[PDB]
């Protein structure tokens, strides 16, 4: 059955532009191993097909067979439920807390980057750093599967590659595109990088950057910087 993912186009109206929902879904369909097409949508010059398919204008959206699905959380849940085993791997996290760890990082970033109040900058920076810390703690805390892990290097320190264990799950598909925006935008416009001190966060990222499902679905750095330029330059 035809699977077509419609995603935000970038600055030339045709390549993949900034959108962490679009990347999340691209990652979910890559991980499922299904055959799909991805179509970019220049929201300033929508085609008549797109206009007819998705009158509301939500983006990203999914065309499945003849059915149109909107809202990323809904599209992911639908895909998880319809692209299911034996044919397709389940990608849902086993540990519910894998789906919440790091949930506030993107909101704290957005507040920090859109801020133009010089007196709030350090406060918002610290709010971003604390959210990254919560994530780091989740990543260095052994998961259930690792209880009293006989093979641990350090006592009570986790070794797994990703949020929920050693395989990418739907929780990584949500979080990783958001962290990529954070890293790209914060480096270009605030001179901010995630502290090397967050060792769980940097291990997670090195492992993710080594996977093509993540690396090959990232928009070009340039598109994210372009999308964030106006707001991130507000701070004087």
Curated annotation (Swiss-Prot):
Motif G-site in this chain: 19-22
Record's bilayer topology term: Single-pass membrane protein
Effect of residue 54 to S: Loss of dimerization and of ion transport activity
The keyword Membrane appears for this protein: yes
Recorded superkingdom: Eukaryota
Domain GST C-terminal: 88-228
GO biological process: chloride transport; platelet aggregation; positive regulation of osteoblast differentiation; regulation of mitochondrial membrane potential; signal transduction
pH effects: Optimally active at neutral to slightly alkaline pH.
Main location: nucleus
EC number(s) per entry: 1.8.-.-, 1.8.5.1
Pfam families in UniProt: CLIC-like_N, GST_C_2
Listed PANTHER family: CHLORIDE INTRACELLULAR CHANNEL PROTEIN, CHLORIDE INTRACELLULAR CHANNEL PROTEIN 6-RELATED
Assembly and oligomerization: Monomer. Homodimer (in vitro). Interacts with TRAPPC2. Dimerization requires a conformation change that leads to the exposure of a large hydrophobic surface. In vivo, this may lead to membrane insertion. Interacts with AKAP9.
UniProt-recorded name of the protein: Chloride intracellular channel protein 1
């Amino acid at each position: 059955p035809q699977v077509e993912l419609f995603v935000k186009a970038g600055s030339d109206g045709a390549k993949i532009g900034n959108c962490p929902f679009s990347q999340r879904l691209f990652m979910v369909l890559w991980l499922k191993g299904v055959t799909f097409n991805v179509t970019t949508v220049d929201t300033k010059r929508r085609t008549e097909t797109v206009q007819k398919l998705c009158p509301g204008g939500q983006l990203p959206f999914l065309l499945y067979g003849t059915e149109v699905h909107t809202d990323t959380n809904k599209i992911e849940e639908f895909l998880e439920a319809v692209l299911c085993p034996p044919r397709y791997p389940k990608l849902a996290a086993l540990n519910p807390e894998s789906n919440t760890a790091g949930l506030d990082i993107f909101a704290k970033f957005s507040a920090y980057i859109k801020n133009s109040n010089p007196a709030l900058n350090d406060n918002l920076e610290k709010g971003l750093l604390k959210a990254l810390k919560v994530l780091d703690n989740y990543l260095t805390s052994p998961l259930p599967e690792e209880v009293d892990e006989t093979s641990a290097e350090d006592e009570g320190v986790s070794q797994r590659k990703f949020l929920d264990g050693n395989e990418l799950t739907l929780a990584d598909c949500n979080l990783l595109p958001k962290l990529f925006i954070v890293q790209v935008v914060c480096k270009k416009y605030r001179g901010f990088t995630i502290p090397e001190a967050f060792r769980g966060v940097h291990r997670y990222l090195s492992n993710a950057y080594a996977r093509e499902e993540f690396a090959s679905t990232c928009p070009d750095d340039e598109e994210i910087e372009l999308a964030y330029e106006q707001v991130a330059k507000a701070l004087k």
